[PDB]
Design a protein around this ligand. Structure first.
Ligand code: NA
Ligand code: NA
Lengths: 197, 197
């Protein structure tokens, strides 16, 4: 069901042009689930999220995005690779490939690496994801130095969504332990709005 | 997974305002899967689709849409009720409730009833949907008179997507027998673009 949905969205994305004014939100279902243009009241903000996507899935569909030379790319990816048992090291290594590809194909694009969001097992759903809540911090501990090493920005969403007493996502923003309710996207908007306009 | 995703999208929709200039695309995953504003290059076009949605699910979340008094509503719903074994009669009866609610809460809104799209069992997926491909025609045969009886428009997408020799969807537009590839959304755009601008 992922590969067919991936192909549906990816072939649609190849028909929608990307211009140099565009602000791209790129990632998996946490990106897919939002109406980003409405959330920011900005016609230039475009959704390139695909539910279920992994790091190499994003890498393989970069061409219709970088060929447009967009203004900004906000990237949030990785949690689905955690659910497959992939280590934080390999995930960082695959995110590094995405960063280098973008920097070489579109050097004027501003790239923003967003921290992987925390998860919570309290609702008993997506146990492949939520049982590995400790890996989220392992990834972000490596993701921020990668951003500095490559000269791109790092956005700490994690600290605003997490409960410091548990290390898991605050249940007020989620109904399944992984995805966001409307209130979760409003918090996300408040954090990244300065980077958008 | 449907009820949690339904709540995620519905609570997001309650935070996104609807204005009198807006053109709303309302329905299930076939509506959810498109970036409608990009497809028409129109900032006023907004996505209100929810994967898995049924007729009463649409009915129950009408308030944040009709309270904005939008300019146009394009509705495509029903195929998920077919997969649950519901008869065409009851589906038409529930679509009638949606039409009356919209006409009473926002009488200036132009409502466009779109034909249910054909399905195809050739890919062996979504057998609850694709095994009942004959019900699609039963619904559209009742849906067009309902549109005339209520003074709203009926848009025949079915005739452009179907193979006349089979009564099922042309496989060139789908990779699973139910959802659309990018080429399918381009055909949809060509059919309804006159009704949008
Ligand atoms: Na909750
Ligand atoms: Na096909």
């Amino acid at each position: 069901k992922y590969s067919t949905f991936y192909e549906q969205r990816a072939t649609l994305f190849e028909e929608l042009p990307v211009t140099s004014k565009d602000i791209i939100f790129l990632g998996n279902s946490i990106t897919n689930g939002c109406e980003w243009a409405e959330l920011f009241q900005n016609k230039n903000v475009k959704n390139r999220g695909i539910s279920g996507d992994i790091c190499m899935g994003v890498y393989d569909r970069l061409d219709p995005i970088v060929k447009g030379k967009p203004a900004k790319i906000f990237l949030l990816i990785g949690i689905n690779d955690v659910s497959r048992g992939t280590s934080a090291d390999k995930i960082i290594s695959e995110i590094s490939m995405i960063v280098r590809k973008i920097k070489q194909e579109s050097p004027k694009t501003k790239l923003y690496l967003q921290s992987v969001l925390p998860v919570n097992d309290c609702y008993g759903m997506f146990n492949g994801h939520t049982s590995r809540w400790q890996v989220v911090k392992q990834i972000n501990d490596l993701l921020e130095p990668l951003a500095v090493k490559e000269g791109v920005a790092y956005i700490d969403l994690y600290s605003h969504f997490v409960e410091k007493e548990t290390g898991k996502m605050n249940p007020v923003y989620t109904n399944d332990g992984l995805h966001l309710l409307g209130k979760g996207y409003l918090l996300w908007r408040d954090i990244v709005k300065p980077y958008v306009d």
